[PDB]
């Protein structure tokens, strides 16, 4: 439930029972023979796994520095790592003899790979999104619908994925008999956190092998982007406890540190409560501040629990990227390696290309991928330009 | 050279010098050891190969039929069979000491996946395409142009794919020296129908093996879309020499076969010279047809010469889809099965889906799904 003082069940009574319920659920399957023969059956002959791990040779060369790697989390069937997160708890749902999904989205990305979970597994799917990202994220609310999922407007608050979040909450309290609640990343009151990191954990059981075969050693950074943090979880967990291998979460500058247009919780963020987990987040009066990216996965006034913790205890080491450092990484990935990356994953990547000058040529980086690019073209379009 | 009949090398003598360099070039590098270690590499570690074989259980289920498997290429980097393609050709063009490639599009797919191969591999890109579809492709041109590539307008002729592949045979008898041409489908004149197959042949050898791990035995049919052959051959191939394997391409109906508007070469058109090769083309006087489909992918009036050959010695079989039946095919596997399709590939789904109904529920289908249908959403929403 904690990872140091971080974590929690933060909730209303009324949530105690849906928590324990599900808690109870997965201590019995996480194990259980038929649940992960059927789970790696649906991440092997539908998501596609496992995603391959690419050597930068060009990147690299410019560069003049560390050797760069990437795990192409791009791959996954629908273009981003949320996918290996949205069939693992599908999957529960429907082993829990559950009918219903229901999740948050705001840039859309999650709401998309719940709405193709529950399409593959013959569920329903309701999707809370806050209005003002509704309106932004037209051809994801599109995606969602050709999925067979209900887009429902989130219209209290700020409208956005925090309003989301607490809709879905409410739902899931009168419905959880037959409906899971599919949070999509990191966070909430436990046992999500836990939950969605052992889903994303196959990343980088899947990176550690690849790279051992490809370079007869562990790497020495591994460097992820981080919103709620579960690509990062997912890459960073299994090599926790190999100490020479240091870990670098990526969050979103923005504008920049000083603008106040940024999502950088961790490194700019207070203690706080909300969604059930005591964590960082950005706050004023301890009301949420508004955040921004160019890279709408990154805009989440929190973070995971367990980077909090990691970031405490200084196993990993958190950054921050700019809007501007972002962008000049997307264009330069797919101009040098034939790469469309996400701008959320174009963060993790521009920390990357500064990490490499400063090291030697033996040394090496793996960079977590954890999308591509389609879903941002029309953002990259309206602001690079035609 | 031929395939029964088609095919053939019928083209200016301008053309005879690259054409014979790149078939010696080919002959060289195809079995070679260092060229295959780089392809396979690549196809790998950058494209993703394999891709799955995934069984399509609720859409089996619902239509009561035979099993529906669906071979991944949705998977594949760029979202599409051609990175298979563009990658082998691309490679082959960096063995020559070429440093250039320029490539044609319709659709815009093969001018993306030349452009992922060309930045892949440090070469200049540049891709011709008809004026008119770049107007209505403009986030293909976008992602075109990210890669690194230049877009070069056609405006000549009908300003569609025919023109595009025009212009750029003839830059390429000005440039071969530097530059590989890297056609986008199993057409043109020898020896580019067969390196496009045997870059493609890998979706069969794939499937193949992963449908004897699966069922422990071949497929009763494989049924693949068809606008210039490429994905069809790559799949169709291996399974040739498999007598009992029934292979079935799909055509675009487009708006009825008795509409004028559709891109059904190989059941309505007429053998003919062109693009340097005799095979089936939409003519009306004897000039190529304008055509169509909903599927911007199958729109050349034409068709590859192994088609051609495999349908009149009636090894494979063609029949068409409409545009509507395409459209409710990409919602269908989209609401059923979790998987968003090309519309090209949807025309195959939606073949398979009628196929199903009627065969036995111990009867395998293999559908080559060529693409993602993510490039699609635009058109997809417009309607
Ligand atoms: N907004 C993103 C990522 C995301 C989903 N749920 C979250 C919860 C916390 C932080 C980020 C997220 C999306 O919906 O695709
Ligand atoms: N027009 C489509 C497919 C294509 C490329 N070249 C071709 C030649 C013949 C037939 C089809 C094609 C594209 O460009 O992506
Ligand atoms: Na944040
Ligand atoms: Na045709």
Same mark, same amino acid.
């Given at each position: 439930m904690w990872f140091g003082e971080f974590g929690g069940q933060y909730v209303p009574e009324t949530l105690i029972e849906p928590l324990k319920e599900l808690e109870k659920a997965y201590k019995r399957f996480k194990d259980?023979?038929?649940?992960?023969?059927?789970?790696?059956?649906?991440? !092997?002959?539908? %998501?596609?796994?496992?995603?391959?791990? $690419? $050597? &930068?040779? =060009? #990147?690299?060369? /410019?560069?003049?520095? &560390? /050797?760069? $790697?990437? !795990? =192409?989390?791009? #791959?996954?069937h629908g273009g981003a790592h949320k996918t290996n997160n949205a069939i693992g708890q599908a999957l529960? %749902? /429907?082993? @829990?003899? !559950?009918?219903?999904?229901? +999740?948050?989205?705001? &840039?859309?990305?999650?709401?998309?790979?719940? &709405? @193709?979970?529950?399409?593959?597994?013959?569920?329903? *799917?309701?999707? $809370? @999104?806050? +209005?003002?990202?509704?309106? =932004?994220?037209?051809?994801? *609310?599109?995606? @969602? !619908?050709?999925?067979?999922?209900? *887009?429902?407007?989130?219209?209290?608050?700020?409208?956005? #994925?925090?309003?989301?979040?607490?809709?879905? #909450?409410?739902?899931? *309290?009168?419905?959880?008999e037959y409906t899971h609640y599919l949070i999509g990343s990191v966070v909430g009151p436990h046992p999500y956190p836990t939950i969605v990191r052992d889903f994303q954990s196959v990343i980088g059981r899947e990176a550690k092998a690849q790279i051992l075969e490809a370079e007869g050693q562990l790497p020495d950074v591994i460097v992820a982007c981080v919103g709620g943090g579960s690509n990062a979880m997912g890459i960073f967990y299994p090599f926790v406890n190999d100490k020479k291998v240091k870990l670098v979460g990526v969050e979103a500058g923005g504008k920049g540190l000083e603008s106040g247009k940024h999502s950088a919780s961790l490194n700019a963020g207070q203690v706080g409560v909300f969604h059930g987990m005591l964590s960082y987040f950005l706050q004023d009066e301890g009301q949420i501040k508004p955040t921004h990216s160019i890279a709408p996965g990154l805009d989440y006034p929190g973070v995971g629990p367990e980077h909090a913790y990691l970031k405490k205890i200084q196993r990993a080491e958190y950054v921050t990227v700019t809007d501007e450092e972002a962008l000049k990484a997307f264009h330069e990935l797919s101009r040098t390696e034939g790469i469309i990356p996400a701008l959320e994953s174009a963060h993790a990547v521009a920390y990357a290309m500064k990490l490499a000058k400063e090291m030697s040529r033996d040394e090496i980086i793996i960079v977590n991928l954890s999308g591509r690019g389609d879903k941002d073209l029309d953002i990259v379009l309206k602001v690079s330009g035609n």
């Open positions: 259980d023979e038929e649940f992960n023969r059927q789970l790696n059956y649906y991440l !092997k002959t539908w %998501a596609g796994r496992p995603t391959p791990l $690419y $050597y &930068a040779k =060009r #990147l690299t060369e /410019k560069i003049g520095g &560390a /050797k760069i $790697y990437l !795990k =192409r989390e791009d #791959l996954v529960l %749902a /429907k082993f @829990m003899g !559950k009918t219903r999904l229901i +999740a948050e989205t705001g &840039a859309g990305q999650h709401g998309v790979a719940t &709405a @193709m979970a529950g399409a593959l597994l013959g569920m329903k *799917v309701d999707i $809370y @999104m806050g +209005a003002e990202d509704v309106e =932004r994220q037209k051809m994801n *609310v599109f995606r @969602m !619908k050709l999925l067979g999922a209900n *887009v429902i407007p989130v219209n209290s608050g700020s409208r956005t #994925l925090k309003d989301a979040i607490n809709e879905a #909450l409410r739902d899931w *309290v009168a419905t959880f």
